[PDB]
Ligand binder design. Structure first.
Ligand SMILES: c1coc(CNc2nc3ccccc3[nH]2)c1
Length: 168
């Protein structure tokens, strides 16, 4: 069986806990609790093939910098999730990308750009911003609304295909 090493990252105030739980047991929790290290693995059918998704959600604080290079050495797919309500996270994506690219040590990297909290009326970061920024990276941007379950699975399937075809 094929294992997809994916890691969930982002900023504080986005709610990665809801993103992980929604994809695992299919539940949405409004409660925000900072998780450090939890195991999130589930078998999903990708394009007619059942595969095991090995996902590890990590911290998003600057307090945890030493363990950064650790999970970045095993994780193949980095889930850079930001929030449209937080324009800071939009910028932090570049810094995070820089750190990731620093560990990856490669220009070509199959990653995606997804944002949460798209259900909030306080949209600080508009679509044009992300869509235009994606042009510089060379990777598409996907809107992930875990609130109403829109784009959740869709954005996850594309990532797998990009990585699968890259291994071929
Ligand atoms: C118990 C503790 O970790 C596990 C699963 N391992 C695991 N390695 C990973 C490396 C990168 C991303 C997710 C990963 N997930 C089970």
């Amino acid at each position: 069986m094929t294992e997809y090493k994916l890691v969930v990252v982002g900023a504080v105030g986005v709610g990665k806990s809801a993103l992980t739980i929604q994809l695992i047991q299919n539940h949405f929790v409004d409660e925000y609790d900072p998780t450090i290290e939890d195991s999130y693995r589930k078998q999903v059918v990708i394009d007619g093939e059942t595969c095991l998704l090995d996902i590890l959600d990590t911290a998003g604080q600057e307090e945890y910098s030493a363990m950064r290079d650790q999970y970045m050495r095993t994780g193949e797919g980095f889930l850079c999730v930001f929030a449209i309500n937080n324009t800071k996270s939009f910028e932090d994506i570049h810094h995070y990308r820089e750190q990731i690219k620093r560990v990856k040590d490669s220009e070509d990297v199959p990653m995606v750009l997804v944002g949460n909290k798209s259900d909030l009326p306080s949209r600080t970061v508009d679509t044009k911003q992300a869509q235009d920024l994606a042009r510089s990276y060379g990777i598409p941007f996907i809107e992930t609304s875990a609130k109403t379950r829109q784009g959740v699975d869709d954005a996850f399937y594309t990532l797998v295909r990009e990585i699968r075809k890259h291994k071929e």
